[PDB]
């Protein structure tokens, strides 16, 4: 049985980077070279392995994470990076064995009148740990006075909206991102080529 990579890549809707989705792939066979030869991917840069070599390797579990970010923030979905997305939204470990795939989605995720449904975390007191997912929508406390659920001075809503329009610059255009994570657990390897 082939792996459900169509359900993650060709999905009609994607998540916001702050609430990124995770697909746990199990008990299947995958052609990673069929992925790579889509000629539609603007970024498909694998760290610590190669797409061809992946077809020979076996893994216990494979994770497909997915979200939407700005064009100019795709450089942050990499090991060893800092910035609002890497620090407060999606953090990759510095010891990353996996692939990072991204493509432009301006035709799918931008709308006249602005598509304001995709969000990102702007305020957080501490960087995320690798593969952490902070869905908190509590008001961010910037001063000493407690906020009591009311946005105001020194009290901020922690999420901001991407404004995806059709004619934004490519750096401000939406990009869909899929991060494949490969996992040896001390358990039976069930995803192979």
């Amino acid at each position, epitope marked *: 049985n082939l792996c459900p990579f169509g359900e993650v890549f060709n999905a009609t809707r994607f998540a916001s980077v702050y609430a990124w989705n995770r697909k746990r792939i199990s008990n299947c066979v995958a052609d990673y070279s069929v992925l790579y030869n889509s000629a539609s991917f603007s970024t498909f840069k694998c760290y610590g392995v190669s797409p061809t070599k992946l077809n020979d390797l076996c893994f216990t579990n494979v994770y497909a994470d997915s979200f939407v970010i700005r064009g100019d923030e795709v450089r942050q979905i990499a090991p060893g990076q800092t910035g609002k997305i890497a620090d407060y939204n999606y953090k990759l470990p510095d010891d990353f064995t996996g692939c990072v795939i991204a493509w432009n989605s301006n035709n799918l995720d931008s709308k006249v009148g602005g598509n304001y449904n995709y969000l990102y975390r702007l305020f957080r007191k501490s960087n995320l740990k690798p593969f952490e997912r902070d869905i908190s929508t509590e008001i*961010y406390q*910037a001063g000493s006075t407690p906020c009591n659920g009311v946005e105001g001075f020194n009290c901020y809503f922690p999420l901001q909206s991407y404004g995806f329009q059709p004619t934004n610059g490519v750096g401000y255009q939406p990009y869909r991102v899929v991060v494949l994570s490969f996992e040896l657990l001390h358990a039976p390897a069930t995803v192979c080529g």
Partner: antibody
Amino acid sequence: VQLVESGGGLIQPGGSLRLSCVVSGFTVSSNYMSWIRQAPGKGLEWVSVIYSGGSTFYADSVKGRFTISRDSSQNTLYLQMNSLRAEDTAVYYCARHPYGDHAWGQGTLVTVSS
Amino acid sequence: DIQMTQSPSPLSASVGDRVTITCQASQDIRNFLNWYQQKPGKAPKLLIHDASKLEAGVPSRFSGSGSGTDFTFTISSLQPEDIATYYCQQYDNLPLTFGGGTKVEIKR
């Protein structure tokens, strides 16, 4: 909200100063803050920013020489300026700049001359 | 870097007339444009945030327009105390960059 800069003055080229910015009205360790300088007679130039969670970014004119930092105990922002050059002669401002409610200090003049 | 280009260098008007300062961005910066007023000898003051949103306590004659790469800043009726150097600044993309400045002067 008050922001007060200090630590500026004359210094010979190649020397080091540490600027300070003491904050009243918000928590320096929870907020985005930047250093913006203005050379005498010229315009504004962004120098350094520290993020709410600690990540730091610098202008290209000041990399490897300037370091931005914070102390939560004293609610103070710092700019350690090493290997100073005459082009670094400016009034330096601290600010809750990029994101979060706006605030600017009154500046501290640094002159780099022999 | 994103480079901001302002209405050349000095710009003058009579008391009560209009003044239009234009700011051009090298690339798309959305509505993430700040406008500062700097009176002589004093610190810069944020007048408009997010291209059009007037900060608190700022008189009604100040206003801001534009999205993408071209923006304008307007004083609907210049007052003698509006003598200053006005700066535009993009804040959402790093190397945070300012315009060169536009000095505004009273004609008299």
